Amino acid sequence: MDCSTNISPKQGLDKAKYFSGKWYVTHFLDKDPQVTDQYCSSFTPRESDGTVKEALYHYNANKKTSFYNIGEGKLESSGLQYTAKYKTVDKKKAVLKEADEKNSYTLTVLEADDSSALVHICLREGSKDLGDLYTVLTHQKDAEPSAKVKSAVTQAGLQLSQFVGTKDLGCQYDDQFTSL
Numbered sequence: 001m002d003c004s005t006n007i008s009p010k011q012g013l014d015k016a017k018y019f020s021g022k023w024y025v026t027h028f029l030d031k032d033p034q035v036t037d038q039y040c041s042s043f044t045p046r047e048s049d050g051t052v053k054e055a056l057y058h059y060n061a062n063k064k065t066s067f068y069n070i071g072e073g074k075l076e077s078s079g080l081q082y083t084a085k086y087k088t089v090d091k092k093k094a095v096l097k098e099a100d101e102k103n104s105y106t107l108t109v110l111e112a113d114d115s116s117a118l119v120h121i122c123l124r125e126g127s128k129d130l131g132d133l134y135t136v137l138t139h140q141k142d143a144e145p146s147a148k149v150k151s152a153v154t155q156a157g158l159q160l161s162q163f164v165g166t167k168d169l170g171c172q173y174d175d176q177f178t179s180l
């Protein structure tokens with residue numbers, strides 16, 4: 001599998017709209033899933049002087065367990081786009097497995113407004129592309145994505161109906177973890 005190629009950040013995006021609040025994934029489009037378990041996700045991205053740091057939460061909807069990461073990377077000159085290396089952590093943010101030089105994800109912000117966002121994520125290990133995901137984001141669980149973000153999905157060449165809606169997965173979130 002190869003990550004989607006026609007991906008660059010929307011120029012003109014306000015970083016104050018993206019690096020704010022927390023995000024919950026309402027809809028995801030996974031090209032070629034790594035495993036067949038389905039996940040819910042929430043995360044809290046912040047930026048300072050070109051360096052992004054984000055607390056990341058995954059809930060496995062099949063097994064009903066959850067895992068935690070902290071990503072860190074630098075913003076590209078293109079706009080709201082960054083490649084992050086990542087640590088695994090426990091629910092209290094104690095570090096377990098350190099970040100390395102071969103595992104990374106590249107996140108590209110396709111749209112972002114006061115309530116909603118559309119991002120693309122390419123997860124890699126070494127020379128291998130492992131995950132390719134588009135995610136529609138909102139600031140509260142089960143909030144409706146804005147018309148502007150729905151337009152962005154259609155502008156990305158995609159069909160929103162072909163995404164998996166997470167509402168039906170029975171997602172559980174750890175909002176203590178994603179605070180800060």
Ligand code: HEM
Nearest residue numbers: 025028034035038039040041043056069086088105121135
């Ligand atoms: C609902 C949306 C999402 C789904 C369905 C999803 C799905 C997945 C899956 C299936 C894996 C492999 C897990 C396993 O090995 O069992 C994974 C790993 C990972 N994802 Fe997500 N993901 C989502 C959102 C995100 C977002 C928004 C980010 C970053 C902001 C992200 C970053 C990562 C990272 C860093 C890993 C590797 C974690 C590790 O191995 O320690 N994912 N994702």
